Amino acid sequence: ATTNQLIRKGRTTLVEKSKVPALKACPQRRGVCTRVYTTTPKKPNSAMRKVCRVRLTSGFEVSSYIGGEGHNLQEHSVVLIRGGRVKDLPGVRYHTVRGSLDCAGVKDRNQSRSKYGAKRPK
Amino acid sequence: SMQDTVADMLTRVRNAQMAKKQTVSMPSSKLKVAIANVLQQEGYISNVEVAQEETKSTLTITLKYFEGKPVIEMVKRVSRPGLRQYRGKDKLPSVKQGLGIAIVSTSKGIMTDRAARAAGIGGEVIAFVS
RNA sequence: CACGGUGUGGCCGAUGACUGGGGUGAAGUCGUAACAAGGUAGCCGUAGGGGAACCUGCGGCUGGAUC
RNA sequence: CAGAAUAAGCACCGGCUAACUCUGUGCCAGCAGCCGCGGUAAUACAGAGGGUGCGAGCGUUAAUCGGAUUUACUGGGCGUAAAGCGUGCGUAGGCGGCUUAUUAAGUCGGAUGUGAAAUCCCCGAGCUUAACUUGGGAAUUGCAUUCGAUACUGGUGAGCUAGAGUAUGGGAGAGGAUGGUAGAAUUCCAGGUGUAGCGGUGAAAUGCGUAGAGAUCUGGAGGAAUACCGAUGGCGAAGGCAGCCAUCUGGCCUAAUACUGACGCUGAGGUACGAAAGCAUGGGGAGCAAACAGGAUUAGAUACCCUGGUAGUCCAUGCCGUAAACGAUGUCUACUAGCCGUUGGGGCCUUUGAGGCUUUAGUGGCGCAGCUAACGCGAUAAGUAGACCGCCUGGGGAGUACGGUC
RNA sequence: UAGUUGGUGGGGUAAAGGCCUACCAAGGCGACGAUCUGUAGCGGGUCUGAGAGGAUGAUCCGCCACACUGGGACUGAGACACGGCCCAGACUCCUACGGGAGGCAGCAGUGGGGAAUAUUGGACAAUGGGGGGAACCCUGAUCCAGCCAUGCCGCGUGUGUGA
Numbered sequence A: 001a002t003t004n005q006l007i008r009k010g011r012t013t014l015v016e017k018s019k020v021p022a023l024k025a026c027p028q029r030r031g032v033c034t035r036v037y038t039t040t041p042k043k044p045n046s047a048m049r050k051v052c053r054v055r056l057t058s059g060f061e062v063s064s065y066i067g068g069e070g071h072n073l074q075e076h077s078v079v080l081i082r083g084g085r086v087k088d089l090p091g092v093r094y095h096t097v098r099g100s101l102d103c104a105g106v107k108d109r110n111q112s113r114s115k116y117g118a119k120r121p122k
Numbered sequence B: 001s002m003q004d005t006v007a008d009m010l011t012r013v014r015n016a017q018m019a020k021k022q023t024v025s026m027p028s029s030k031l032k033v034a035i036a037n038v039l040q041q042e043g044y045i046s047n048v049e050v051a052q053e054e055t056k057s058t059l060t061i062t063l064k065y066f067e068g069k070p071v072i073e074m075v076k077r078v079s080r081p082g083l084r085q086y087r088g089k090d091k092l093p094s095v096k097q098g099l100g101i102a103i104v105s106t107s108k109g110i111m112t113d114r115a116a117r118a119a120g121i122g123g124e125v126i127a128f129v130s
Numbered sequence C: 001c002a003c004g005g006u007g008u009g010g011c012c013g014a015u016g017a018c019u020g021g022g023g024u025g026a027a028g029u030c031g032u033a034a035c036a037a038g039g040u041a042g043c044c045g046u047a048g049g050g051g052a053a054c055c056u057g058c059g060g061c062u063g064g065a066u067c
Numbered sequence D: 001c002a003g004a005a006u007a008a009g010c011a012c013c014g015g016c017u018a019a020c021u022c023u024g025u026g027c028c029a030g031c032a033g034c035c036g037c038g039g040u041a042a043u044a045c046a047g048a049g050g051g052u053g054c055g056a057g058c059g060u061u062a063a064u065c066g067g068a069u070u071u072a073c074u075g076g077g078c079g080u081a082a083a084g085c086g087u088g089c090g091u092a093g094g095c096g097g098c099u100u101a102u103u104a105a106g107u108c109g110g111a112u113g114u115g116a117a118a119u120c121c122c123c124g125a126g127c128u129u130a131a132c133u134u135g136g137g138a139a140u141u142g143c144a145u146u147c148g149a150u151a152c153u154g155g156u157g158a159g160c161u162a163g164a165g166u167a168u169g170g171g172a173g174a175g176g177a178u179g180g181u182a183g184a185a186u187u188c189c190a191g192g193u194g195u196a197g198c199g200g201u202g203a204a205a206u207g208c209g210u211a212g213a214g215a216u217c218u219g220g221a222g223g224a225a226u227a228c229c230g231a232u233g234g235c236g237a238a239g240g241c242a243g244c245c246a247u248c249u250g251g252c253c254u255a256a257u258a259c260u261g262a263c264g265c266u267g268a269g270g271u272a273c274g275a276a277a278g279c280a281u282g283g284g285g286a287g288c289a290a291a292c293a294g295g296a297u298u299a300g301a302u303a304c305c306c307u308g309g310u311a312g313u314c315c316a317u318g319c320c321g322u323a324a325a326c327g328a329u330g331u332c333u334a335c336u337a338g339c340c341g342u343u344g345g346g347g348c349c350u351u352u353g354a355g356g357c358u359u360u361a362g363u364g365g366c367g368c369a370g371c372u373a374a375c376g377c378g379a380u381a382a383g384u385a386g387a388c389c390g391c392c393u394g395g396g397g398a399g400u401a402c403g404g405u406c
Numbered sequence E: 001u002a003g004u005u006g007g008u009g010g011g012g013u014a015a016a017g018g019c020c021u022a023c024c025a026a027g028g029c030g031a032c033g034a035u036c037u038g039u040a041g042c043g044g045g046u047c048u049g050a051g052a053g054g055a056u057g058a059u060c061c062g063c064c065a066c067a068c069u070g071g072g073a074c075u076g077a078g079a080c081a082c083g084g085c086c087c088a089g090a091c092u093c094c095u096a097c098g099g100g101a102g103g104c105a106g107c108a109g110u111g112g113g114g115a116a117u118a119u120u121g122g123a124c125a126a127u128g129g130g131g132g133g134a135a136c137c138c139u140g141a142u143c144c145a146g147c148c149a150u151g152c153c154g155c156g157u158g159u160g161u162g163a
Helices: A003-008 B005-019 B030-042 B113-119
Strands: A029-039 A049-056 A061-065 A078-083 A094-096 B023-027 B045-052 B057-063 B075-077 B101-106 B109-112 B123-129
Touching: A029 A061, A049 A078, A061 A078, B005 B023, B005 B030, B005 B057, B005 B075, B005 B123, B030 B045, B030 B057, B030 B101, B030 B109, B030 B123, B101 B113, B109 B113
Parallel strands: A061 A094
Antiparallel strands: A029 A049, A029 A078, A049 A061, A078 A094, B023 B057, B045 B057, B075 B123, B101 B109, B101 B123
């Protein structure tokens, strides 16, 4: 561009959108479990992965993955959700914090315990 | 149309050096003669001549080649009609860490950035030569 | 003069029986339009026709093979 | 005074990235920031052993700048990757030839005042050290007033002709608008000669014909288009423009004097022109031919092929405003090896008439330097520079919805 | 845009002024963005960046504005006044039904919201502020204490020997 063109119209910046709109710029959110179920991965992956549709205090309804092996979640549980995508599951952009409100820490786990929220064995 | 005669002169010199001519000629003006005088004093060119027929004035410059390459390896116009550039005495540009010269027009005439800093004045930055 | 009332008209937002198109997924069904001269060279504008990719008329381009 | 007595966890070990093996499970369970692991030997899943990095902390999520030259002022692009408006004219604006005198607005320099303290940085001081506190500096890149300089830009006065334009001679052209007119051919009609086929296809059939075709000869009617010349030719801003003649009319090339004296370039908004198809009103209709009808082909044919055929294609008066409207290359100016063609002019030379050198404005083919990712471009630049404008910022959704104008 | 832009006479203010008023005139602003509309307290500063820039305005300091929601004025040197007055509105409380009362965006604290942020503490000894001649009184400013690994800095959880 010429100097005159820049003076008449300056450079324009395009705004950026967040990848976790439902959090509304908060580290975590609290929600009530609306539907717990399992889904199947996108190709070339094959499994049965545990997810749940949750309604948040932000006024949104989203889907959240459940990490670890073995959970006690069910209908109407109260859970804390954080950010993080599952990649091979389309549309699942959030994670459930293990052992926070009604979710419990995984059992018989001795490494990476701070994740999955398992206390020290005696 | 032609709107920057100084840029035209610098372009003529650059093209002549790249084509390996011995002399280059153009329509003349006092500003062009003043710039050519500074170039000759600094040693980038050999001879500057002015001829007058009746009212037309022709300026002729003799070029220098040392070894195989031309002496002037780079000449850039800095101030242009679409953007004038003015510098204070403490912000005069340095060319190739002092191995090249910046041509500056000050209230005491046309000189190099070195002489301008010595005299403690600023002005318009015409060109970089190296 | 604040608050309030009446009538009429704007704008924003939420909501609505029904309806239209878009994307993603899985390849269930009907074909084979494009990629080679892809088996009628392809594409652009416009008009008409057709279950569907598309077909035909007029003008244009080579980002068309062989001669 | 007492006595080691009261006091270590968290993440990770396929690559990006320092640190590897064994068991358990078998596209399951599961991991995952990106690329990707697991479908019987998993250094990538879980446990264990070992190790690595941190350490009263260790990890995850969220947010800002950076890396991102990924809005490019410093510091990017537009032939083919995204990107030059279809083409002109022109308003505001931006920029603008040479010489001279003057002004001191831009520009540069000095002085004075101000720019609170805290904060940042430097030299010290006090905290057992450090954080922290604190003295003095430096800095606060700015603003205002006043005094100076005049090279450049701007203003004013004067002058000049290389840009731009005017008058007089000559030249080429499918440039435009209007009206006449000529020949070839197709269709139809009328009439002679004449008698069983004609037509069409890969092969056929639909179709035409014994109330007489097709073929051949004569005459008539009507519409549309202009063979040969014809050309990598010409003219036009682009879209485009071809028989011949007259009338009205625009631009271009070329020679020398004369004249004005910067009167210039570009151009947001705006405005004019703008292929084909399409629309409105009235005419015309030979040939061709969307839609449609029939015959074939095919598994099916909606198509390609064949026989017919209506809008339309043509004219007058208006609208529409879009094309791969392309050189996929905005306009203007200057400079930078050569070789070979062609169109319209000027000049010189022979020497008698046809050639040979130059110069100018167009139009083509190669190619040095230079440029480019490469292909390629290369005086008709995509090279070297200047002025102004338009446009681009991953692929889809999408030149779409809503609103508005026409 | 019609008190709108300017002028004259008058009024009004501590003070210039369409600040108000009666006439006279038709001006004033706008592509250098008027009007309308969305968002927003501003600066010294803070974070990042080689710089140019970008993001930001907790804690400290200066300025501005507000005090349940709107409209007013009084007293006073000074207010259109957080813990003053009048009026209107919504809400809450006491009542013997006669009549009344109130405003934590001061400190502590409760409910609610939220991923999430503390004690219904001590003293005016120090620095300030108000009153008083003084003695002295008041001061949730302030100076201190309590809670929280929230951050920065420092220390410890032992040392040598021992195959």
